[PDB]
Design a protein around this ligand. Structure first.
Ligand SMILES: [Mg+2]
Ligand SMILES: [Mg+2]
Ligand SMILES: [Mg+2]
Ligand SMILES: [Mg+2]
Ligand SMILES: [Mg+2]
Ligand SMILES: [Mg+2]
Ligand SMILES: [Mg+2]
Ligand SMILES: [Mg+2]
Ligand SMILES: [Mg+2]
Ligand SMILES: [Mg+2]
Ligand SMILES: [Mg+2]
Ligand SMILES: [Mg+2]
Ligand SMILES: [Mg+2]
Ligand SMILES: [Mg+2]
Ligand SMILES: [Mg+2]
Ligand SMILES: [Mg+2]
Ligand SMILES: [Mg+2]
Ligand SMILES: [Mg+2]
Ligand SMILES: [Mg+2]
Ligand SMILES: [Mg+2]
Ligand SMILES: [Mg+2]
Ligand SMILES: [Mg+2]
Ligand SMILES: [Mg+2]
Ligand SMILES: [Mg+2]
Ligand SMILES: [Mg+2]
Ligand SMILES: [Mg+2]
Ligand SMILES: [Mg+2]
Ligand SMILES: [Mg+2]
Ligand SMILES: [Mg+2]
Ligand SMILES: [Mg+2]
Ligand SMILES: [Mg+2]
Ligand SMILES: [Mg+2]
Ligand SMILES: [Mg+2]
Ligand SMILES: [Mg+2]
Ligand SMILES: [Mg+2]
Ligand SMILES: [Mg+2]
Ligand SMILES: [Mg+2]
Ligand SMILES: [Mg+2]
Lengths: 179, 339, 393, 122, 210, 46
RNA sequence: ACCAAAGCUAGCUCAACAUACUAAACAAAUACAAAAAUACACCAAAAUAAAAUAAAACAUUCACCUAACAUUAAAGUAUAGGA
RNA sequence: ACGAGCUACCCAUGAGCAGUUUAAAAGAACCAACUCAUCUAUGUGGCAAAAUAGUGAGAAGACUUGUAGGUAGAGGUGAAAA
RNA sequence: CUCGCACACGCUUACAUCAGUAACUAAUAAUAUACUGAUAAUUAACAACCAAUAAACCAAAACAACACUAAAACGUUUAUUAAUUACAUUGUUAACCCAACACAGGAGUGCACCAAGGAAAGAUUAAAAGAAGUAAAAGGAACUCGGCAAACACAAACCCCGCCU
């Protein structure tokens, strides 16, 4: 069963390989979950063959015969992963209602920033964990000057961007007086 | 200089063929041709030998209690190692009355045997020495479970210039693909003793299979013929290394070749299964400059793996193979020629 | 007094509790809700952790009284590495035997007979000495854990070669790392020897009694030597968990029931790791008595009585250069009393098998003053070893 | 003064520094110092039978697409739970206290694959 | 660096030295006991020579007296008596039971505290008088010490008497002991230098008067 | 003798003296990291 | 004749208005030696700003000197100052 | 704020010293590896921001040296040369 | 003519194959381990990662027999519980590192003095001055601050100052 990494031998020496369109999201939504589970491996073997052919075309210094097949396949993979994620997050919104798959908290780190800290799996609680208590989630009083300076810098950047767009609008209006 | 470290106990897939390529030895299935000029020596009592072997089985399987084993997996190394020492000691003691040479022989227990030799040529692919020619060196670091050493040499099975139509398999690949790896340390050629020991010849070797090379582990690894291949590679490595050790404590080397052949016997055991091998070294000139016009070859006769017992339970040995014990007694009954 | 702890190196005491917790009827506000430390909030007090499903590796160790075999009476256990101070005196006291300087006359008659020697005795023993000390290793200077089991196994092979002249040595076998337990009571305290041995020789047939009834009767009025400030307990390990069951390493119906020789190995480089010779003798006395008591209670029963058939167990202790020899005859089970029949023990002490060995040739003033090989040789040690091996036949 | 911009990798450090490349652990260190691999941590790959299954990785060019309607929680409720709830309310057998017959589950920890802890990888 | 001129010495193991002379094994029998001396060895940590003392089920390393040899018998007691005791060189007795002219070592400060003073090699204090249930001794620095009479002390002089007459052959021996050389800075002597004749400081007393 | 070679490289010493963990164990090293972030450094530490 | 030269753009600067203020990306790994899923803990902290200068030196003193309270006047006024 | 990856001194953990003379592994002697740098000549934008060649001193100790940690400037460290 | 082979640390593809070099790198060409482009590569047995809790332990390593002082690194068995179940992860190249350089400098360990590594001269001529080496009649320190340097010598004494290493 090692030949599935390659194409059929009639198609090895052909310069152009025609193929169909990529799988559309609305076409993915009509199928059942077992159909998606089988279609994932059906796409997987073809993508492995296309990557093998791409590497061999890179090796033997010849162009890959119609390399848009890999683009269509990875578009199909993105579509199927997307519709499975719609089914899973919709079903989780019905059952629990939590928006995100991983637990997390909005935290204030030592650097002063606001960070979405995702949680991890541990067999022991948080107060007993040696590694976790030496982490610090708070900001010291000296951090506030740097937090303010970060604010001041991004405020200056957006000020110059707004003035730049205003100047470009002025320059185009003065350049072309079609009004 | 750099050398390949050759392991007799190996996990390689086709290791016997690569070892035959490194060794210039041909493997023949079946026993060597029997020297039928024997006197009426088999007045052997089979019942006492069977009772001794069964007593060793019952001791290290049922009777001798260990410290309590909490993994409960019952690792066969600690089970079958003193089984092999007791089997070798008991069979030597019971067969010393028939073979007086075994009384004057010495017994080694877990004492290493080393051999170093050159084979073939190689052009260096990389480095500042690229394009130059440097020979391939090999080192065998082997630790036999038991050894028997004799002051006098065992007799030959076949003559020195005896030719076989089968020819040495040549692999068209680098030795790194086995896998084997180059390592540098001291070059030792060891018999199991130093030179001043008067017993520069031997009788037999005994080799226990480790835990990683078990038949159950191979069947989990999806390995059918590897059971025979591992035993083959172990015999071809160990017996060749030890016969080369005999030849180079006897003063023979690459440009002296070998005057009269070196003959050895080997017993390779998994915890249930026994295998019997014979080796004859004629070639010690494995250097490529001396191997252009060298017609002679080394020979390794092999025996297919056969179990000794079967499903031992509650002081009763259910199955027993008498032919394995007979082959072991015929191996232990070999004597040097007298004059 | 002077306590042996240090305030810095000890684990610190917990920080003193926040003053919110000392207010009755007040709920403290802590950082437990945000599951991380926060300055300005009180430190929460958590209950001790209870893993409802148990894990084997990661749980706390169970206490010693939780074990089913835990008993209130502290038993004193002797294992392989326990040392005794007045080793011969403590061995004689805790074993209740009598010490004899020579080996028995049967052993000397077996040794001194010229028909019992091997073909070229001195040549084979000197070659065995050279093989153990220099030849068997790739290195120029082999270590003691290498050369001591090699010289022991080589001497066993040398005395095993006599089986063609004496076809009664096939009734023996060697055994390794067995579990031995022998528990008894000796003057209101509970003793137990328990552990393993190096290599133990067993046989189908028992060894014949070696001491005469005149010696047994003269042993009766012998008084045991006593020593006041050290208790005879000292050197043993106190244990509160044990089983009162005499356990030899072999189960019922074993074809080789009677041990004939024990072998004791001192395989270590450093001087503090190896036993002193008195400690080595004490170890062989108490282990040989453990094997003999296992024999004399397995064949007779748990009742304590004098033995009409003595039990003889031999042992050899080995340093690699200097040997100790023991023949121990057990006659008495009821060791609670101090007035009854005492057992017997013959000990040859500090038999030097060779004086010194030279692995490399020493050169003084550009000439060789001493050649390679062992200096000094005493074959009487090998003769005693051969008699101890050939004592069955 | 070394390379700060280069990523810190196990190839760079000494023999002491050994860092994984992102793989998942499959066992632990056993009694003898060897590695004991746990079969339970091994990802058992789940494959169907594709011989008797008819589908192809590419779609016909003449096959039309559809108006893109993403899957919504309201649409999933109206398609799955709403006929049962409407039928039970018109039959009078609707129970506000117990909703387990309509597909609702109160606590996730009973079942094998949880959603909010995300027990299943993929 | 807080103490100068220390470092670069030989590797030394530390011996656990038991300072409390009267230490019963169990509290069931608090009576006086008698132990046996096995060996006397050199200790690299102190100037004295130590001795291994075994009794019951335990051994202790103690500070050896002048003529303590291998295989000796040493009595430890707390019993005070009005006929006193006949003091040998090994025995440990309270200061109330000793005769007036007794030479002592390893003097305990507070009852139950343990031996702190007179520990160096060859140094011995002398009991002076016993008044009102209180012992007064004279230290090797010729200072009087007032102590409760129930404090245990060991009779005799500490071993290795010729430690004061031990000669150091070279600076290499100082570096072996671990004493780094002094600094090369030339410091002019102040007013602190000179031969100061001072009267003897008064008796240091650890008996707490209520 | 000859100079110019005061830098003898060692990754253990480098990551122990100028590492991220060593920077964050001290408030001064934390302020060093905030100054490098305010300047906009590509590499905050080793 | 080589070397050279010339562009008008990228973009900044100062304000005003203004929401109300640490942007974007977070699928995984990130304070083990950062970007390494996985084990019995410890965690944390504050104490006046000083001086270069001016007083032609320099000791008491020396406006602003990282503490929101703005403008027109009172007013450079009363006061405080090696006055 | 940052610096003891060079150097000054310590705490750990290791590794080297062949031959020769002597009862000696004696801070003895000859002389290698090894460690310093006495003297001279080149070099002086050089091979080199301190080197090369010849010659020298120690070479079983107060000796070199690998890895790692510690002591930080109103200081550290120093067999004091500021 | 002889600083070789490998490992540890450190560097980071600079390694290997093919093709090109008008120009960029070699302080110059020829071409290529040092430039350019494409493609591949280092496969674990070696090394890292790799159990605690109580207890019997005074007795050096120096060929260690047994000793000296400066008192000396380096683990056993006994009991309690240690998931038990093929194949885990990671380093495997090099002519290489620190010195601004393809620098006569610095650089730890194990075995060797070659069985391995390399090339002082781009081609002429053979002026002065300069560096290095060899040899010299007669004299032998008369040169110079000084027997500095050199030499077929490589010795014997007196002081000063510090005992000495
Ligand atoms: Mg840099
Ligand atoms: Mg690394
Ligand atoms: Mg490396
Ligand atoms: Mg494994
Ligand atoms: Mg000290
Ligand atoms: Mg001392
Ligand atoms: Mg001084
Ligand atoms: Mg001075
Ligand atoms: Mg620099
Ligand atoms: Mg001024
Ligand atoms: Mg001024
Ligand atoms: Mg100011
Ligand atoms: Mg005033
Ligand atoms: Mg440091
Ligand atoms: Mg340092
Ligand atoms: Mg020497
Ligand atoms: Mg010297
Ligand atoms: Mg000298
Ligand atoms: Mg210097
Ligand atoms: Mg020089
Ligand atoms: Mg010259
Ligand atoms: Mg010299
Ligand atoms: Mg200072
Ligand atoms: Mg000065
Ligand atoms: Mg000065
Ligand atoms: Mg570089
Ligand atoms: Mg060029
Ligand atoms: Mg390599
Ligand atoms: Mg030229
Ligand atoms: Mg000239
Ligand atoms: Mg000249
Ligand atoms: Mg000349
Ligand atoms: Mg002349
Ligand atoms: Mg003159
Ligand atoms: Mg000169
Ligand atoms: Mg001269
Ligand atoms: Mg002269
Ligand atoms: Mg001087």
């Amino acid at each position: 069963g090692l030949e599935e990494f390659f194409d059929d031998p009639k198609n090895w020496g052909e310069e152009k390989v025609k193929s169909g369109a990529s799988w559309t999201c609305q076409q993915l939504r009509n199928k059942s979950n077992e159909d998606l589970h089988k279609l994932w491996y059906v796409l997987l073997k073809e993508r492995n063959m296309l990557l093998t052919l791409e590497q061999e075309a890179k090796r033997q210094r010849l162009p890959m015969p119609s390399p848009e097949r890999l683009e269509k396949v990875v578009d199909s993979m993105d579509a199927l992963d997307k519709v499975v994620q719609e089914r899973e997050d919709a079903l989780r919104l019905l059952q629990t209602g939590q928006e995100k798959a991983r637990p997390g908290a909005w935290r204030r780190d030592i650097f002063g920033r606001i960070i979405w800290h995702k949680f991890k799996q541990w067999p022991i609680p948080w107060y007993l964990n040696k590694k976790y208590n030496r982490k610090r989630f708070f900001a010291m009083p000296y951090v506030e000057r740097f937090v303010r300076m970060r604010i001041e810098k991004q405020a200056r950047i957006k000020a110059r961007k707004r003035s730049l767009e205003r100047k470009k609008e002025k320059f185009l209006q003065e350049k072309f007086p079609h009004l | 200089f750099m050398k390949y470290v050759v392991y007799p106990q190996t996990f390689a897939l086709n290791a016997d063929n690569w070892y035959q390529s490194f060794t210039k030895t041909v493997f023949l299935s079946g026993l060597p041709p029997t020297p039928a000029k024997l006197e009426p020596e088999p007045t052997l009592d089979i019942t006492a030998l069977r009772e001794a072997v069964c007593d060793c089985l019952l001791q290290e399987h049922f009777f001798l209690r260990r410290k309590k084993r909490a993994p409960v997996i019952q690792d066969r190394e600690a089970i079958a190692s003193p089984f092999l020492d007791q089997l070798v000691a008991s069979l030597t003691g019971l067969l010393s009355v028939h073979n007086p040479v075994l009384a004057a022989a010495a017994l080694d227990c877990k004492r290493p045997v080393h051999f170093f030799w050159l084979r073939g040529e190689e052009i260096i692919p990389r480095g500042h020495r690229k394009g130059r020619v440097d020979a391939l060196r090999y080192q065998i670091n082997d630790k036999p479970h038991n050894q028997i050493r004799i002051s006098r040499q065992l007799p030959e099975f076949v003559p020195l210039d005896y030719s076989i139509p089968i020819e040495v398999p040549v692999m068209s690949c680098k030795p790194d693909k086995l896998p084997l790896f180059k390592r540098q340390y001291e070059n030792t050629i060891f018999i199991g003793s130093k030179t001043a020991d008067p017993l520069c010849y031997g009788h037999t070797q005994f080799h226990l299979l480790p835990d990683k090379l078990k038949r159950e582990k191979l069947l989990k690894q999806n390995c059918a013929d590897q059971i025979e291949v591992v035993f083959r590679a172990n015999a071809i490595a160990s017996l060749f290394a030890w016969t080369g050790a005999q030849a180079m404590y006897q003063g023979f080397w690459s440009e002296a070749d070998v005057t009269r052949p070196f003959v050895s016997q080997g017993v390779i055991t998994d915890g249930k299964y026994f295998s019997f091998f014979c080796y004859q070294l004629n070639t010690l000139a494995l250097t490529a400059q001396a191997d252009q016009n060298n017609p002679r070859k080394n020979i390794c006769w092999g025996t297919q793996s056969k179990p000794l017992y079967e499903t031992i339970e509650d002081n009763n040995v259910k199955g027993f193979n008498d032919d394995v014990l007979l082959q072991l007694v015929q191996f232990l009954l070999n004597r040097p020629k007298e004059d | 007094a002077y306590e042996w702890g240090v305030r810095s190196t000890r684990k610190p005491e917990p920080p003193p509790l926040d003053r919110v917790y000392e207010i009755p009827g007040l709920e403290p506000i802590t950082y437990a809700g945000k599951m991380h430390f926060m300055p300005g909030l009180a430190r929460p007090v958590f209950p001790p952790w209870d893993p409802g499903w148990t894990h084997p590796k990661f749980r706390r160790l169970p206490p010693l009284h939780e074990h089913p075999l835990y008993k209130d009476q502290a038993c004193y256990v002797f294992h392989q590495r326990c040392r005794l101070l007045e080793g011969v005196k403590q061995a004689l006291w805790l074993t209740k035997t009598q010490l004899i300087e020579g080996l028995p006359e049967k052993v000397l008659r077996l040794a001194d007979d010229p028909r019992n020697h091997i073909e070229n005795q001195d040549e084979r023993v000197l070659n065995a000495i050279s093989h153990a000390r220099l030849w068997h290793s790739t290195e120029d200077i082999p270590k003691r854990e290498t050369y001591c089991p090699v010289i022991v196994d080589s001497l066993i092979q040398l005395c095993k070669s006599q089986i063609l002249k004496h076809p009664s040595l096939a009734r023996r076998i060697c055994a390794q790392n067995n579990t031995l337990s022998a528990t008894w009571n000796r003057e209101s305290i509970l003793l137990q020897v328990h552990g393993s041995s190096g290599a133990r020789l067993n046989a189908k047939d028992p060894l014949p009694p070696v001491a005469s009834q005149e010696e047994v009767e003269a042993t009766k009025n012998h008084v045991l030597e006593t020593f006041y400030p050290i208790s005879p307990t000292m050197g043993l390990q106190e244990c509160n968990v044990y089983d009162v069951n005499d356990d030899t390493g072999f189960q019922e119906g074993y074809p080789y029931p009677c041990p004939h020789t024990l072998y004791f190995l001192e395989s270590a480089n450093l001087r503090p790791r190896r036993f002193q010779p008195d400690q080595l003798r004490a170890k062989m006395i108490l282990f040989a008595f453990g094997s003999a008591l296992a024999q004399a209670r397995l064949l007779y029963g748990n009742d304590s009585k004098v033995l009409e058939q003595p039990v003889v167990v031999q042992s050899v202790g080995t340093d690699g250069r200097l040997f100790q020899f023991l023949v121990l005859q057990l006659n008495t089970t009821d060791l609670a009393s101090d007035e009854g029949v005492k057992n017997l023990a013959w000990v040859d002490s500090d038999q030097l098998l060779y004086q010194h060995f030279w692995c490399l040739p020493v050169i003084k003033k550009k000439v060789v003053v001493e050649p390679v090989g062992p200096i000094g040789f005493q074959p009487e040690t090998f003769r005693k070893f051969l008699a101890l091996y050939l004592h069955g036949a | 003064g070394a390379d700060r911009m280069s990523k810190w990798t196990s190839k760079r450090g000494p023999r002491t520094f050994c860092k994984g490349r992102g793989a998942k652990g499959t066992g632990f260190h056993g009694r003898d110092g060897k590695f004991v691999q746990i079969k339970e941590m091994i990802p058992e790959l789940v494959v169907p039978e594709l011989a008797g299954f008819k589908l192809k990785p590419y779609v016909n060019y003449r096959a039309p697409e559809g108006t893109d309607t993403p899957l919504t929680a309201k649409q999933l409720f109206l398609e799955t739970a709403a006929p049962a709830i409407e039928k039970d309310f018109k039959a009078g057998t609707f129970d506000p206290e117990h909703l387990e017959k309509y597909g609702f589950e109160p606590t996730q920890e009973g079942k094998l694959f949880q959603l909010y802890p995300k027990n299943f990888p993929r | 660096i807080q103490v100068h001129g220390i470092g670069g010495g030989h590797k030394q193991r530390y011996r656990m030295i038991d300072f409390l002379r009267f230490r019963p094994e169990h509290e069931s029998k608090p009576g006086p006991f008698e132990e046996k001396v096995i060996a006397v060895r050199y200790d690299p940590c102190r100037s004295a020579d130590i001795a291994l003392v075994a009794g019951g089920n335990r051994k202790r390393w103690i500070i050896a007296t002048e003529n303590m040899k291998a295989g000796d018998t040493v009595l430890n007691s707390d019993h005070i008596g009005r006929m006193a005791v006949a003091a040998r060189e090994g025995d440990a007795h309270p200061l109330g039971a000793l005769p007036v002219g007794t030479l002592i070592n390893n003097v305990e400060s507070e009852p139950g505290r343990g031996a702190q003073y007179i520990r160096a090699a060859g140094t011995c204090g002398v009991l002076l008088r016993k008044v009102n249930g209180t012992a007064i001794i004279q230290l090797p620095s010729k200072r009087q010490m007032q102590v409760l009479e129930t404090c245990i002390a060991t009779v005799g002089r500490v071993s290795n008497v010729d430690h004061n007459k031990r000669v150091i052959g070279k600076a290499g021996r100082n570096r072996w002991l671990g004493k780094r050389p002094n600094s090369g800075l030339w410091q002019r002597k102040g007013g602190w230098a000179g031969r100061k004749i001072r009267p003897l400081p008064p008796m240091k007393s650890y008996v707490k008067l209520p | 003798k000859a100079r110019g070679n005061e830098y003898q490289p060692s990754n253990i010493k480098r990551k122990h003296k100028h590492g991220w963990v060593r920077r964050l164990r001290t408030p001064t090293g934390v302020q060093v990291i905030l100054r490098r972030m305010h300047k906009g450094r590509k590499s905050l530490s080793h």
